Swiss-Prot record, chain E:
Pfam families: Proteasome (PF00227), Proteasome_A_N (PF10584). Its main location: cytoplasm. Keywords: Acetylation, Cytoplasm, Nucleus, Phosphoprotein, Proteasome. GO terms for biological process: proteasome-mediated ubiquitin-dependent protein catabolic process; response to virus. The modification N6-acetyllysine is found at K66, K167. This is Proteasome subunit alpha type-2. Phosphorylated on tyrosine residues; which may be important for nuclear import. The modification Phosphotyrosine is found at Y2, Y20, Y72, Y117. Component of the 20S core proteasome complex involved in the proteolytic degradation of most intracellular proteins. This complex plays numerous essential roles within the cell by associating with different regulatory particles. Associated with two 19S regulatory particles, forms the 26S proteasome and thus participates in the ATP-dependent degradation of ubiquitinated proteins. Belongs to the peptidase T1A family. NCBIfam families: PRK03996.1 (NF003075). Induction: Down-regulated by antioxidants BO-653 and probucol. Down-regulated in response to enterovirus 71 (EV71) infection (at protein level). CDD domains: proteasome_alpha_type_2.
UniProtKB/Swiss-Prot annotation, chain F:
It is found in: Cytoplasm; Nucleus. Component of the 26S proteasome, a multiprotein complex involved in the ATP-dependent degradation of ubiquitinated proteins. This complex plays a key role in the maintenance of protein homeostasis by removing misfolded or damaged proteins, which could impair cellular functions, and by removing proteins whose functions are no longer required. Therefore, the proteasome participates in numerous cellular processes, including cell cycle progression, apoptosis, or DNA damage repair. Belongs to the AAA ATPase family. It comes from Homo sapiens (Human). It comes from the Eukaryota. Component of the 19S proteasome regulatory particle complex. The 26S proteasome consists of a 20S core particle (CP) and two 19S regulatory subunits (RP). The regulatory particle is made of a lid composed of 9 subunits, a base containing 6 ATPases including PSMC5 and few additional components. Component of a complex with USP49 and RUVBL1. Interacts with PRPF19. Interacts with TRIM5. Interacts with NDC80. Interacts with PAAF1. Interacts, in vitro, with the thyroid hormone receptor (in a thyroid hormone T3-dependent manner) and with retinoid X receptor (RXR). Interacts with ERCC6. This is 26S proteasome regulatory subunit 8.
UniProtKB/Swiss-Prot annotation, chain G:
Component of the 19S proteasome regulatory particle complex. The 26S proteasome consists of a 20S core particle (CP) and two 19S regulatory subunits (RP). The regulatory particle is made of a lid composed of 9 subunits including PSMD12, a base containing 6 ATPases and few additional components. Interacts with ERCC6. There is a cross-link at K76 (Glycyl lysine isopeptide (Lys-Gly) (interchain with G-Cter in SUMO1)). There is a cross-link at K76 (Glycyl lysine isopeptide (Lys-Gly) (interchain with G-Cter in SUMO2)). Component of the 26S proteasome, a multiprotein complex involved in the ATP-dependent degradation of ubiquitinated proteins. This complex plays a key role in the maintenance of protein homeostasis by removing misfolded or damaged proteins, which could impair cellular functions, and by removing proteins whose functions are no longer required. Therefore, the proteasome participates in numerous cellular processes, including cell cycle progression, apoptosis, or DNA damage repair. This is 26S proteasome non-ATPase regulatory subunit 12. It is linked to Stankiewicz-Isidor syndrome: A neurodevelopmental disorder characterized by delayed psychomotor development, intellectual disability, behavioral disorders, mild dysmorphism, ophthalmologic anomalies, feeding difficulties, deafness, and variable congenital malformations of the cardiac and/or urogenital systems. Belongs to the proteasome subunit p55 family. It comes from the Eukaryota.
UniProtKB/Swiss-Prot annotation, chain H:
The 26S proteasome consists of a 20S proteasome core and two 19S regulatory subunits. The 20S proteasome core is a barrel-shaped complex made of 28 subunits that are arranged in four stacked rings. The two outer rings are each formed by seven alpha subunits, and the two inner rings are formed by seven beta subunits. The proteolytic activity is exerted by three beta-subunits PSMB5, PSMB6 and PSMB7. It is found in: Cytoplasm; Nucleus. It comes from the Eukaryota. Belongs to the peptidase T1B family. This is Proteasome subunit beta type-7. Component of the 20S core proteasome complex involved in the proteolytic degradation of most intracellular proteins. This complex plays numerous essential roles within the cell by associating with different regulatory particles. Associated with two 19S regulatory particles, forms the 26S proteasome and thus participates in the ATP-dependent degradation of ubiquitinated proteins. The chain holds residues 108 to 114 of 277 of the full protein. Expressed at a low level in colonic mucosa. Up-regulated in colorectal cancer tissues. The gene is PSMB7.
Amino acid sequence: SKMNLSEEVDLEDYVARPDKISGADINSICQESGMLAVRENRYIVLAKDFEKAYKTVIKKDEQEHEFYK
Amino acid sequence: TGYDLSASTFSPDGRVFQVEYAMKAVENSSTAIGIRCKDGVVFGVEKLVLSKLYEEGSNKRLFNVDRHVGMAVAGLLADARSLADIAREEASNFRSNFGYNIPLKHLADRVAMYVHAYTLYSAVRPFGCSFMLGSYSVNDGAQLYMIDPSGVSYGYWGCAIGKARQAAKTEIEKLQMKEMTCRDIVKEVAKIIYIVHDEVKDKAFELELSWVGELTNGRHEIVPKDIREEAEKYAKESLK
Amino acid sequence: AAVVEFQRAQSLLSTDREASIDILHSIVKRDIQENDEEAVQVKEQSILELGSLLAKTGQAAELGGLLKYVRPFLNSISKAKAARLVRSLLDLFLDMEAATGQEVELCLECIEWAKSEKRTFLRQALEARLVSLYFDTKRYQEALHLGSQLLRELKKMDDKALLVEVQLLESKTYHALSNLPKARAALTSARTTANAIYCPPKLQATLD
Amino acid sequence: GSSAGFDRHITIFSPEGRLYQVEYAFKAINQGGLTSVAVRGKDCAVIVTQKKVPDKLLDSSTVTHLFKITENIGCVMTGMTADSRSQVQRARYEAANWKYKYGYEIPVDMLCKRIADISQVYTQNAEMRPLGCCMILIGIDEEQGPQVYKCDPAGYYCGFKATAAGVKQTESTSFLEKKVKKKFDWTFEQTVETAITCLSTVLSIDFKPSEIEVGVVTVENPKFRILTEAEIDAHLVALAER
Amino acid sequence: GYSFSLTTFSPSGKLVQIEYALAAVAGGAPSVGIKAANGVVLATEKKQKSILYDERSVHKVEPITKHIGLVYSGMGPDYRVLVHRARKLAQQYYLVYQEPIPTAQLVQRVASVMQEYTQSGGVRPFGVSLLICGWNEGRPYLFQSDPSGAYFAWKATAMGKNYVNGKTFLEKRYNEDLELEDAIHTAILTLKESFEGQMTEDNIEVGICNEAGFRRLTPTEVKDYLAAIA
Amino acid sequence: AEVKGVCTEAGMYALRERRVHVTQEDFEMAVAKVMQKD
Amino acid sequence: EVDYSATVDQRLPECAKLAKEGRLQEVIETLLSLEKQTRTASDMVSTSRILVAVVKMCYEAKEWDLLNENIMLLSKRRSQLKQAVAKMVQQCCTYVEEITDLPIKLRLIDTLRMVTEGKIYVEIERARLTKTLATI
Amino acid sequence: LHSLSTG
């Protein structure tokens, strides 16, 4: 709510993800989205910025082999 | 720690340490090189004499697994001879079944798989020898493969196995092997073997030379004594 | 065949809704052979889309006659698809706030169909909707009776989510009867059952 | 990560129900330092893998992780080279046995199903270790079309629209997932370019037509062919010019 | 191969390796088996970690005969091995008797194999629990075979991750008068309680056995049953 | 201990409505919160 | 970098003459190739002139649809230089001011305000353009 | 058997 987002960004895309992340992780995701927006000389955060920020912040190694289930 | 006592046990980093120890056994032996030139393959072995009592020809590290294939070994000589017999029987079976000389690619892929069969179970240990199979034919051409204790067979232009493998490879890289013939490659192999030899360390080596090429009609034979002595003289002169 | 008419109706969606209504109604009124695996999915999709459009055009006659007319058709498609179609059509009629006067009638018809098909969960949902309809149609006594039956049935199966809604409906019905003690008791039961579980924001807002 | 007895030395269950030997076999795949990427298109399947030739002495014609299991089925191996050759030989034998016993070419799904059944025994019997290799088979099916199947040391197996194995398996998987989300049935050239772009972007190499091997299968010719350096160079130039 | 048993009796009289195989089972994907009055339903969470995995390439609910099907919770490859074993045993029974194997007999033979793997030399117990559904004598049959080789006749049960709460849910949501469609509804609800995220027609696998035999539901039918949930 | 916690939670529910005397509804809500929710 | 400089100096008058002759789509394709070369070369002064010449070409020829499509494509090129887009928009708002036809001016304003949305380097133009739109 | 394995 404090960031100048674009209407093309749907937060439910990243909310529905099964990653077990904390509130600081969410704040870091939004912060890196703003960071990527700033890098390209933009004052509005697009959906690609949020996708890249989520991938960067989560950076979760799989750590679980599929044969176990 | 218990992670290296068997070949059927993986290390927490995903490495079979028994195979690596078998590789170190190869790295503890004298250097044997092999160069695939334009019209054949030449094998050279720095066969040290541990005592003057052994006759000239004992512990032959150059084998004949077939009439057109030669084998240069490095590491445990007992395992080397066992693998030489395995390759001999593989070539014999190929000839008795399909009716023609076994291609070097197929012989390498078969003996390498026999070697790999010893790197999976705790009932056996990996072979402690690495060997190069070299051959020549008018159709296939000059071929040179190296197989390590793990069972990885790779084709080569110039290869070396032993404790001076890196220095031998550095000396080999200087050669323009893809253009010169066997008659020059024998001299250069002698030069490389003499260069990588350490006289202050284990000394009194013998140069074991063999080749297989069009000048031998695709037959692996020991290099004739006159040519071997000429190559030895050239190698000694190259050391100044 | 009918897929071309479905695409034509989809194109007519940009045009007048009633214009596409002709295509969808012609597809629905179309008779079908034994199986017609392609035609049955197209017919079901046409029924669903025509109901969706009538949910905006607000044609009580067409939407109401759809449910009473496709009843033979429900015996051809699979039970899951039939139940989904019944739920969608009845929900679209009930969300349309126009009190045409036959909401209770066709809700009871769907309840009878669910009883015939032995679909207990569907029947319970339809009975809760019927209690809501009874409250919205000033039929407080029938609402209380059906709410008591549904309350016992949902208590047996530990369906707290629907139990809270039925208890709230009973509390509203008793408040409409100016029976404050019974309405307070029903509200207390609803609040305790809601406390026993997680309430979605809609249910929590209704309870509050 | 609890342990009790020899649960880290043989394929027996740990206190929490884990086979540590199988996981170590999985870690053995990255020992080779190579990454393979397979991408499935609307009418083709492509396997690409980096080929590393440290010195000119090595015969680059023999360093090939692309193996022709059958005429219509190809594979790319990631992990221990000797175990890779073992799995390739076993797959070739199983394909030939299927052709002999049943009279028709073995389906790609069933080939890796049999291979994974073979490798599952290694994870149940304690006298052998699992093969530290991963097979990715690609082939054109009669009806299902292109098929890509990864085939891991644990005996797990699944079909894939686009998969990857090796050191950079996860980054390549993320890249291919992002590409697939766009939902484009890529043509042959598009699939080859997508695989090459995945490998290049993940590795940041800007490939030359001597550092990667590409093997393709297409519906028009349902045979596995390894692209020559000129054919790979054509795709590399096409990627560079855009 | 090793000739000595890898499963032994602990001083407390427990087959420890069997308990560890059960622990591996409890970490698998949730599976629910519900026996209705007119059939049985086997549901499982066939959720992948990426869209790249082909959902229809491998099926967790696999048929054994025209009237018997399995769904596992545990390790995939072990379930594939046990599926092949169950199919082979069914073929042997059919060849001997010229009649499809009864569900109970197949469960007994499969459990015998799983027990053999708890006593034989150099092998570990199967890390899977098998839910076996069948139809015989006009009656539905549901069984669960654990890694130890013990088989139980279940009216309704849940295995895998979050299976205890699934069982408790099934106690308060199952009655013997349930119909097959309501059984599918209840099984989907049981999966949903242990499910994280949303259940699509592709990330769960449902199969049903009735008088017509055993058949795994196509994704479209699962989509309709899931739309019935919401 | 759970019964004692139920009593304290009934008092807490009485507090949340700014009431002085704990009622039976407070006890039932406390039972639901302590047992079912937790 | 490579400093094309005179390379675009030779090209621009030639393509301008061809555009006056009647060849535009082929000419704008040639300038697209040259813009790709300059943008990969990261030549700010050359890319800005290329974009300005392109938009001027589409404006003088009254190719309103082509002008809008060219603006959309040029603003969306991969790794485009921000100053080149800034100069292009600064040249296009002058055409906006010059145009008196209300529908054409409105469509051009919409395109310019949609290519400049959320970008700092063209925040002033999208401001002034917005003001113009408000006046309209 | 063969059909069950293949499908």
